[PDB]
Amino acid sequence: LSPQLEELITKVSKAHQETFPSLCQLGKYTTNSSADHRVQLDLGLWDKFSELATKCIIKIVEFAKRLPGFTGLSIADQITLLKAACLDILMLRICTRYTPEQDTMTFSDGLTLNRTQMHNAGFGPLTDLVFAFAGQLLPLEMDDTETGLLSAICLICGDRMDLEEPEKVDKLQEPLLEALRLYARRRRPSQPYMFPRMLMKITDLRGISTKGAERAITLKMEIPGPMPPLIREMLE
Ligand SMILES: CCCCCCCCCCCCO[C@H]1O[C@H](CO)[C@@H](O[C@H]2O[C@H](CO)[C@@H](O)[C@H](O)[C@H]2O)[C@H](O)[C@H]1O
Ligand SMILES: CC1(C)CCC(C)(C)c2cc([C@H](O)C(=O)Nc3ccc(C(=O)O)cc3F)ccc21
Protein backbone atom coordinates (compact mmCIF):
# COMPACT_ATOMS: atom_id res chain seq x y z
CA LEU A 1 0.00 0.00 0.00
CA SER A 2 1.30 3.46 -0.95
CA PRO A 3 0.24 6.75 0.64
CA GLN A 4 1.58 8.63 -2.38
CA LEU A 5 -0.49 6.51 -4.75
CA GLU A 6 -3.62 7.06 -2.71
CA GLU A 7 -3.09 10.84 -2.76
CA LEU A 8 -2.58 10.74 -6.52
CA ILE A 9 -5.90 8.96 -6.92
CA THR A 10 -7.75 11.53 -4.85
CA LYS A 11 -6.05 14.42 -6.61
CA VAL A 12 -6.92 13.14 -10.13
CA SER A 13 -10.48 12.27 -9.08
CA LYS A 14 -11.06 15.73 -7.67
CA ALA A 15 -9.50 17.38 -10.75
CA HIS A 16 -11.88 15.47 -13.04
CA GLN A 17 -14.93 16.16 -10.88
CA GLU A 18 -14.21 19.87 -10.56
CA THR A 19 -13.79 20.22 -14.34
CA PHE A 20 -16.59 17.89 -15.45
CA PRO A 21 -19.94 17.76 -13.64
CA SER A 22 -21.64 14.41 -13.37
CA LEU A 23 -24.85 13.60 -15.25
CA CYS A 24 -26.53 13.31 -11.90
CA GLN A 25 -25.35 16.74 -10.84
CA LEU A 26 -26.82 18.48 -13.88
CA GLY A 27 -30.09 20.36 -14.37
CA LYS A 28 -31.12 18.96 -17.77
CA TYR A 29 -32.90 21.14 -20.31
CA THR A 30 -33.86 20.58 -23.92
CA THR A 31 -34.34 22.31 -27.26
CA ASN A 32 -36.89 21.67 -30.00
CA SER A 33 -34.48 22.44 -32.87
CA SER A 34 -34.46 19.80 -35.64
CA ALA A 35 -35.58 17.18 -33.13
CA ASP A 36 -37.36 14.59 -35.28
CA HIS A 37 -35.66 14.35 -38.71
CA ARG A 38 -31.96 14.15 -39.57
CA VAL A 39 -30.83 17.08 -41.75
CA GLN A 40 -27.43 17.89 -43.22
CA LEU A 41 -26.80 20.54 -40.56
CA ASP A 42 -28.73 22.74 -38.15
CA LEU A 43 -26.54 25.82 -37.69
CA GLY A 44 -28.24 26.85 -34.47
CA LEU A 45 -27.31 23.48 -33.02
CA TRP A 46 -23.76 23.68 -34.40
CA ASP A 47 -23.33 27.07 -32.79
CA LYS A 48 -24.50 25.89 -29.38
CA PHE A 49 -22.53 22.63 -29.62
CA SER A 50 -19.27 24.27 -30.69
CA GLU A 51 -19.55 26.85 -27.97
CA LEU A 52 -19.89 24.06 -25.39
CA ALA A 53 -16.99 22.17 -26.98
CA THR A 54 -14.83 25.28 -26.61
CA LYS A 55 -15.72 25.56 -22.93
CA CYS A 56 -14.93 21.92 -22.32
CA ILE A 57 -11.53 22.30 -24.04
CA ILE A 58 -10.66 25.01 -21.49
CA LYS A 59 -11.79 22.65 -18.71
CA ILE A 60 -9.55 19.90 -20.07
CA VAL A 61 -6.54 22.28 -19.98
CA GLU A 62 -7.51 23.11 -16.38
CA PHE A 63 -7.79 19.39 -15.55
CA ALA A 64 -4.39 18.74 -17.15
CA LYS A 65 -2.67 21.41 -15.06
CA ARG A 66 -4.05 19.82 -11.92
CA LEU A 67 -2.34 16.54 -12.80
CA PRO A 68 0.80 15.94 -10.71
CA GLY A 69 3.92 16.84 -12.70
CA PHE A 70 2.12 18.12 -15.78
CA THR A 71 3.20 21.74 -15.37
CA GLY A 72 6.70 20.37 -14.74
CA LEU A 73 6.90 19.47 -18.45
CA SER A 74 8.04 22.04 -21.03
CA ILE A 75 5.32 24.42 -22.10
CA ALA A 76 5.79 23.02 -25.61
CA ASP A 77 5.33 19.45 -24.35
CA GLN A 78 2.22 20.45 -22.37
CA ILE A 79 0.71 21.90 -25.55
CA THR A 80 1.78 18.92 -27.65
CA LEU A 81 0.09 16.49 -25.26
CA LEU A 82 -3.09 18.57 -25.05
CA LYS A 83 -3.33 18.86 -28.83
CA ALA A 84 -2.79 15.08 -29.26
CA ALA A 85 -5.31 13.96 -26.62
CA CYS A 86 -7.95 16.65 -26.24
CA LEU A 87 -10.34 15.18 -28.81
CA ASP A 88 -9.97 11.76 -27.24
CA ILE A 89 -10.90 13.14 -23.83
CA LEU A 90 -13.81 15.11 -25.21
CA MET A 91 -15.12 11.98 -26.88
CA LEU A 92 -14.84 10.10 -23.58
CA ARG A 93 -16.43 12.95 -21.65
CA ILE A 94 -19.56 13.32 -23.79
CA CYS A 95 -20.01 9.54 -23.97
CA THR A 96 -20.13 9.41 -20.13
CA ARG A 97 -23.08 11.80 -20.38
CA TYR A 98 -25.20 9.27 -22.30
CA THR A 99 -28.70 8.40 -21.04
CA PRO A 100 -29.69 5.09 -22.62
CA GLU A 101 -33.36 5.39 -21.67
CA GLN A 102 -33.76 8.67 -23.52
CA ASP A 103 -31.05 8.01 -26.09
CA THR A 104 -29.59 11.42 -25.24
CA MET A 105 -26.29 13.05 -24.34
CA THR A 106 -25.97 15.95 -21.87
CA PHE A 107 -23.52 18.88 -22.09
CA SER A 108 -21.99 20.71 -19.14
CA ASP A 109 -24.66 23.45 -18.99
CA GLY A 110 -27.29 20.74 -18.91
CA LEU A 111 -28.24 20.90 -22.58
CA THR A 112 -29.66 17.47 -23.43
CA LEU A 113 -29.84 16.56 -27.13
CA ASN A 114 -31.40 13.51 -28.64
CA ARG A 115 -29.56 11.39 -31.16
CA THR A 116 -31.05 13.21 -34.13
CA GLN A 117 -30.14 16.53 -32.66
CA MET A 118 -26.56 15.35 -32.08
CA HIS A 119 -26.49 14.35 -35.74
CA ASN A 120 -27.91 17.72 -36.75
CA ALA A 121 -25.42 19.65 -34.55
CA GLY A 122 -22.65 18.34 -36.84
CA PHE A 123 -21.88 14.75 -35.82
CA GLY A 124 -23.45 13.73 -39.11
CA PRO A 125 -22.60 10.18 -40.20
CA LEU A 126 -20.46 9.80 -37.04
CA THR A 127 -23.47 10.01 -34.78
CA ASP A 128 -24.41 6.37 -34.48
CA LEU A 129 -20.83 5.19 -34.04
CA VAL A 130 -20.38 7.65 -31.19
CA PHE A 131 -23.61 6.51 -29.54
CA ALA A 132 -22.58 2.85 -29.94
CA PHE A 133 -19.20 3.59 -28.29
CA ALA A 134 -21.18 5.27 -25.48
CA GLY A 135 -23.39 2.19 -25.37
CA GLN A 136 -20.49 -0.23 -24.91
CA LEU A 137 -18.92 1.99 -22.23
CA LEU A 138 -21.94 1.51 -19.99
CA PRO A 139 -21.27 -2.16 -19.08
CA LEU A 140 -17.93 -1.04 -17.56
CA GLU A 141 -19.89 1.06 -15.02
CA MET A 142 -16.84 3.29 -14.56
CA ASP A 143 -17.04 5.85 -11.79
CA ASP A 144 -15.75 9.43 -11.97
CA THR A 145 -12.38 8.48 -10.41
CA GLU A 146 -11.88 5.86 -13.11
CA THR A 147 -12.93 8.24 -15.88
CA GLY A 148 -10.54 10.84 -14.50
CA LEU A 149 -7.57 8.52 -14.32
CA LEU A 150 -8.27 7.02 -17.75
CA SER A 151 -8.42 10.57 -19.14
CA ALA A 152 -5.12 11.41 -17.43
CA ILE A 153 -3.57 8.27 -18.96
CA CYS A 154 -4.76 9.28 -22.39
CA LEU A 155 -3.24 12.73 -22.01
CA ILE A 156 0.11 11.83 -20.36
CA CYS A 157 1.58 9.53 -22.97
CA GLY A 158 5.13 9.61 -24.22
CA ASP A 159 4.31 8.22 -27.68
CA ARG A 160 3.07 11.57 -29.03
CA MET A 161 5.20 12.76 -31.89
CA ASP A 162 7.22 15.95 -31.38
CA LEU A 163 7.63 15.57 -27.63
CA GLU A 164 10.86 17.09 -26.28
CA GLU A 165 10.96 14.89 -23.19
CA PRO A 166 9.17 11.65 -24.02
CA GLU A 167 10.91 9.76 -21.20
CA LYS A 168 9.80 12.31 -18.66
CA VAL A 169 6.21 11.88 -19.91
CA ASP A 170 6.45 8.06 -19.63
CA LYS A 171 7.59 8.36 -16.03
CA LEU A 172 4.65 10.63 -15.18
CA GLN A 173 2.24 8.15 -16.77
CA GLU A 174 3.56 5.23 -14.73
CA PRO A 175 1.85 6.03 -11.40
CA LEU A 176 -1.40 6.87 -13.19
CA LEU A 177 -1.55 3.36 -14.60
CA GLU A 178 -0.65 1.93 -11.20
CA ALA A 179 -3.33 4.03 -9.55
CA LEU A 180 -6.06 2.98 -11.98
CA ARG A 181 -5.34 -0.75 -11.61
CA LEU A 182 -5.22 -0.48 -7.82
CA TYR A 183 -8.40 1.53 -7.66
CA ALA A 184 -10.37 -0.57 -10.15
CA ARG A 185 -9.44 -3.91 -8.55
CA ARG A 186 -10.15 -2.61 -5.08
CA ARG A 187 -13.58 -1.29 -6.06
CA ARG A 188 -14.59 -4.43 -8.01
CA PRO A 189 -12.44 -7.36 -7.00
CA SER A 190 -14.84 -9.85 -8.65
CA GLN A 191 -14.23 -8.25 -12.08
CA PRO A 192 -10.51 -8.46 -12.75
CA TYR A 193 -10.86 -7.76 -16.47
CA MET A 194 -12.05 -4.24 -15.71
CA PHE A 195 -8.62 -2.57 -15.81
CA PRO A 196 -7.47 -4.13 -19.12
CA ARG A 197 -10.88 -3.39 -20.68
CA MET A 198 -10.54 0.24 -19.61
CA LEU A 199 -7.10 0.50 -21.21
CA MET A 200 -8.41 -1.09 -24.41
CA LYS A 201 -10.99 1.73 -24.61
CA ILE A 202 -8.15 4.15 -25.28
CA THR A 203 -7.59 2.62 -28.75
CA ASP A 204 -11.31 2.79 -29.41
CA LEU A 205 -11.30 6.48 -28.41
CA ARG A 206 -8.45 7.15 -30.78
CA GLY A 207 -10.47 5.53 -33.62
CA ILE A 208 -13.49 7.69 -32.83
CA SER A 209 -11.38 10.84 -32.53
CA THR A 210 -9.82 10.10 -35.91
CA LYS A 211 -13.28 9.83 -37.46
CA GLY A 212 -14.33 13.01 -35.69
CA ALA A 213 -11.31 14.90 -37.13
CA GLU A 214 -12.25 13.57 -40.58
CA ARG A 215 -15.78 14.75 -39.98
CA ALA A 216 -14.47 18.17 -38.88
CA ILE A 217 -12.94 18.59 -42.34
CA THR A 218 -16.21 18.05 -44.23
CA LEU A 219 -18.22 20.08 -41.71
CA LYS A 220 -15.97 23.00 -42.39
CA MET A 221 -17.38 23.08 -45.93
CA GLU A 222 -20.91 23.44 -44.56
CA ILE A 223 -20.67 26.20 -41.95
CA PRO A 224 -20.55 29.90 -42.90
CA GLY A 225 -17.27 30.51 -41.09
CA PRO A 226 -14.22 28.89 -39.45
CA MET A 227 -14.61 26.69 -36.44
CA PRO A 228 -13.95 28.31 -33.04
CA PRO A 229 -10.26 28.96 -32.54
CA LEU A 230 -9.65 26.54 -29.63
CA ILE A 231 -11.29 23.79 -31.73
CA ARG A 232 -8.90 24.68 -34.51
CA GLU A 233 -5.97 24.44 -32.08
CA MET A 234 -7.10 20.96 -31.17
CA LEU A 235 -7.51 19.85 -34.78
CA GLU A 236 -4.06 21.03 -35.82
C1 LIG B 1 -6.31 21.09 -27.29
C2 LIG B 1 -6.29 22.56 -27.60
C3 LIG B 1 -5.65 23.34 -26.46
C4 LIG B 1 -4.22 23.74 -26.81
C5 LIG B 1 -3.75 24.85 -25.86
C6 LIG B 1 -4.50 26.15 -26.15
C7 LIG B 1 -5.56 26.44 -25.09
C8 LIG B 1 -4.97 27.09 -23.84
C9 LIG B 1 -6.16 27.68 -23.10
C10 LIG B 1 -5.80 28.33 -21.79
C11 LIG B 1 -6.92 29.33 -21.46
C12 LIG B 1 -6.53 30.10 -20.21
O13 LIG B 1 -7.72 30.39 -19.54
C14 LIG B 1 -7.88 31.77 -19.33
O15 LIG B 1 -9.02 32.25 -20.04
C16 LIG B 1 -10.18 31.46 -19.84
C17 LIG B 1 -11.35 32.11 -20.60
O18 LIG B 1 -11.26 33.52 -20.50
C19 LIG B 1 -10.50 31.34 -18.34
O20 LIG B 1 -11.37 30.26 -18.14
C21 LIG B 1 -12.23 30.51 -17.05
O22 LIG B 1 -13.53 30.67 -17.59
C23 LIG B 1 -14.08 29.53 -18.21
C24 LIG B 1 -15.43 29.94 -18.83
O25 LIG B 1 -15.36 30.17 -20.22
C26 LIG B 1 -14.17 28.43 -17.14
O27 LIG B 1 -14.79 27.27 -17.59
C28 LIG B 1 -12.78 28.06 -16.60
O29 LIG B 1 -12.87 27.07 -15.58
C30 LIG B 1 -12.19 29.35 -16.02
O31 LIG B 1 -10.91 29.15 -15.49
C32 LIG B 1 -9.28 31.11 -17.44
O33 LIG B 1 -9.58 31.29 -16.08
C34 LIG B 1 -8.08 31.98 -17.82
O35 LIG B 1 -6.93 31.54 -17.12
C1 LIG C 1 -19.08 17.27 -34.70
C2 LIG C 1 -17.67 16.69 -34.64
C3 LIG C 1 -17.69 15.25 -35.16
C4 LIG C 1 -16.67 17.47 -35.50
C5 LIG C 1 -16.27 18.77 -34.79
C6 LIG C 1 -15.52 18.49 -33.48
C7 LIG C 1 -14.10 17.97 -33.79
C8 LIG C 1 -15.40 19.81 -32.71
C9 LIG C 1 -16.21 17.42 -32.67
C10 LIG C 1 -15.91 17.30 -31.29
C11 LIG C 1 -16.54 16.38 -30.47
C12 LIG C 1 -16.15 16.25 -29.02
O13 LIG C 1 -16.34 14.95 -28.45
C14 LIG C 1 -16.74 17.36 -28.11
O15 LIG C 1 -16.52 18.54 -28.36
N16 LIG C 1 -17.40 16.88 -27.05
C17 LIG C 1 -17.86 17.55 -25.93
C18 LIG C 1 -17.79 16.96 -24.67
C19 LIG C 1 -18.32 17.59 -23.53
C20 LIG C 1 -18.94 18.83 -23.66
C21 LIG C 1 -19.51 19.47 -22.49
O22 LIG C 1 -19.31 18.91 -21.40
O23 LIG C 1 -20.27 20.46 -22.57
C24 LIG C 1 -19.03 19.43 -24.91
C25 LIG C 1 -18.50 18.77 -26.01
F26 LIG C 1 -18.60 19.36 -27.20
C27 LIG C 1 -17.54 15.60 -31.03
C28 LIG C 1 -17.93 15.79 -32.34
C29 LIG C 1 -17.24 16.67 -33.19
Which domains, ranges and CATH numbers included, belong to the chain? 1-236 (1.10.565.10)
Quote the CA–CA distance of 10 and 155 in Å, as a whole number.
18
Beta-bridged to residue 113, according to DSSP, are 105
Continuous H helices in the chain: 3-17, 43-65, 75-95, 115-118, 127-137, 144-155, 166-187, 194-222, 229-235
Looking at the CA of 236, name the nearest ligand. Answer: 1
Point out the ligand 1 atom lying closest to the alpha carbon of residue 85.
1
Structure determination technique employed: X-ray
Quote the CA–CA distance of 143 and 22 in Å, as a whole number.
10
59 Cα to the center of ligand 1, angstroms:
7
Quote the CA–CA distance of 9 and 3 in Å, as a whole number.
10
Q: Are 211 and 126 in contact (CB under 8 A)?
A: yes
Amino acid occupying residue 37: H
Tell me if 90 CB under 6 Å of ligand 2.
Answer: yes
Q: Are 183 and 175 in contact (CB under 8 A)?
A: no
Q: Are 35 and 207 in contact (CB under 8 A)?
A: no
200 Cα to the center of ligand 1, angstroms:
30
